[PDB]
Structure 1
Amino acid sequence: DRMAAPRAEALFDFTGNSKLELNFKAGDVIFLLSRINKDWLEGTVRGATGIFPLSFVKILKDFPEE
């Protein structure tokens, strides 16, 4: 895609615990790798991967749901 791919702008600064948990900053913006359930999602930002709460990010684009 690289045109309308998924991405959410970090509204605040998050800091996961382990690798499984992602840690971004206010204004990091992730590409979103996938969804966990509804309140938690996955994405890679700042060379870091893991999961993060959707309540701490502004979904600027949803995943490619055909």
Structure 2
Amino acid sequence: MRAEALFDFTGNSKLELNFKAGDVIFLLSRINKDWLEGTVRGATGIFPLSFVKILK
């Protein structure tokens, strides 16, 4: 599925997915209850579920 970012998320590590509010993320899977793995802006990485709205 996909998720629309609600807030900007600037990760510290290259393992974390960077994005800005309004970006639509192509989800890859849940890594745990509070985090997702997804793709956007040419990169892949993990990010907090609470920073996006799942489009479903």
Separation in 2, partners of 1:18, 1:49: 12
Partner of residue 25 from structure 1, selected from 20, 27, 40: 20
**How far did residue 51 of structure 1 move?**
0.3
The 5-angstrom pairing of residues 1-66 of structure 1 reads 7-61=2-56
Consecutive unaligned residues of structure 1, counting only runs of 5 or more, are 1-6, 62-66
Match of 2:38, SS state, is: strand
Q: Greater CA radius of gyration, 1 or 2? A: 1
Q: Deviations over 1:10-34 (max 9, x none)?
A: 0010011122100010001101111
Equivalenced residue count is: 55
* Structure 2 length-normalised TM: 0.90
* 4+ residue segments displaced more than 4 Å: none
Separation in 2, partners of 1:11, 1:41: 15
Separation in 1, partners of 2:16, 2:27: 13
**How far did residue 39 of structure 1 move?**
0.7
RMSD: 0.8
* Structure 1 length-normalised TM: 0.78
More strand by share: 2
